Amino acid sequence: FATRVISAPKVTKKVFFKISINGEDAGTIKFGLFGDDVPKTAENFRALCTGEKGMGKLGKPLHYKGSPFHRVIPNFMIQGGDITSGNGYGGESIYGSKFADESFKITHDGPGLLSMANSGPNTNGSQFFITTVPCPWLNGKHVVFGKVIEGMEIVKKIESLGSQSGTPKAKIIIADCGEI
Structure with a gap:
């Protein structure tokens, strides 16, 4: 018995980051993930928030904790999630290697969307970005899989x-993370 009329992907899982800036607490961002529509991509992000998969294949934890926001661009997006080298050139998915683009059905229509960074087709790892403006030119290239639900x-x-x-002008870290 359907009861809702939603103009967007349904939120099926919720996760959070606790942010530190230059070593000070800066608050919590909460995310809603679109697990009905991009389940493999949503599940990757969720598991990297909890750390529950333990160690990856590159000697580093499959966990966003401690990783920085390494590229931060006013009027565009903020980018993080390099859990291997922690500097923006690395990353690893829970699937053992980079994984395929799951779907481009959800477009970059507005700020606050969670989308996968990549280095071309089918190169999803752990790095992600959050839009701060509509980014339609990224449609068909980056997989959107969630949205900010608190802490925009x-x-x-x-x-x-x-x-x-x-290049950031401060040190912005995911000080803690997890699932709600």
Whole structure:
């Protein structure tokens, strides 16, 4: 017996980041994941939040805890999730290697969307970005899989610490993370 009329992917799992900036607590971002529509991508992100898969194949934890927001661009997006080298050139999915683009059905229509960073077709790992504006030119190239449901103010604060090139002007860390 259906009862809702939703104009968006349904949120099926909720996760969070606790953010530190230059070593100080900056608040919590909460995310809703679109697990009915992109389950493999949603499940990857969820498991990296909890750390429950333990160690990956590259000698590093399959866990977002401690990873930085390494590229931060005002009026575009903020990007993080390098859990291997922790500097923006690495990352690892829970599936053992990069994984395929699951679906491009969900587009970059607005700010606050969670989407996979990549290095071309079918190269999803752990790195992600959060949009701060509509990014339609990224449609068909990046898999959207969730959205900010609380703490968009924190995303905007992070965004304000970036630069046009993306080099951050502060050290922004996922100090803790998990599933709600």
